[PDB]
Amino acid sequence: MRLPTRSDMICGYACLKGTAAMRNTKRGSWYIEALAQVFSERACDMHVADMLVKVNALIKDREGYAPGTEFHRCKEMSEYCSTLCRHLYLFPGHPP
């Protein structure tokens, strides 16, 4: 009656292997923004595994805006790995 040493996890990464993230002194990192956005907005009808797919979509389209530098008009790409075995819905609230 046992299970694998590791399982039922799901990790989201702000950037791919080798690349860097994007922090902004006033808005923060894109990953966190995208995260807070998609989660608050869709946690109600979208499962963590699919919301991260959303965050991916957002992060993929975003371009860097910081003129005069070399960070201007740059890209970034998020990723996530999963060993989850069933949809993971956060069922926010659920009225008493």
Binding site: Y13, T19, T25, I32, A36, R42, L88, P92, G93, H94
Partner: protein, 162 residues
């Protein structure tokens, strides 16, 4: 900047808990938001500017999602593995249905830097919550949010043409 967690119509739940991870406990699980911003050691690492907004944005978010959230700031590699293992053991997990952990700091492929300047292998992090080292969380979804750098280089991108 004011997060709005929309709730789900009970109809949804009755049509989805049937085939998902049981996750209606209160709290909905524990959340840890360890974030290193002020780095000492051989201060080669910049200053996680805006690292405070990220930290807040997440703390709030995880709080409105219904998570008894904890926090740690400017920690050393060793302190992290040490305090992370504690967070992993905390007897509360037995009653909750899931667990969240956000690690935000500087880093490299596979690991994150502590204010200490030393590294902590992310693989070591996960291990602490597996089915062996953390039996109080078996079969319960465990999300991780790694806000770090897997590198030095900046992605320039490439023209998408049809």
């Amino acid at each position: 900047l004011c997060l709005q967690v929309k709730p789900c119509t009970p109809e949804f739940y009755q049509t989805h808990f049937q085939l998902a991870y049981r996750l209606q406990s209160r709290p909905r699980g524990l959340a840890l938001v360890l974030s290193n911003v002020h780095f000492t050691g051989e201060k080669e690492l910049e200053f996680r500017s805006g690292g405070d907004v990220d930290h807040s944005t997440l703390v709030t978010l995880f709080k409105l999602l219904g998570y008894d959230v904890h926090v740690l700031c400017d920690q050393t590699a060793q302190e992290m593995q040490e305090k992370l293992q504690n967070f992993a053991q905390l007897p509360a997990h037995r009653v909750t249905d899931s667990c969240i952990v956000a690690l935000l700091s500087h880093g490299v492929e596979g690991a994150i830097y502590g204010v200490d300047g030393k590294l902590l292998q992310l693989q070591e992090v996960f291990q602490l919550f597996d089915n062996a080292n953390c039996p109080s969380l078996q079969n319960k979804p465990k999300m991780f949010f790694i806000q770090a750098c897997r590198g030095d280089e900046t992605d320039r991108g490439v023209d998408q043409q049809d």
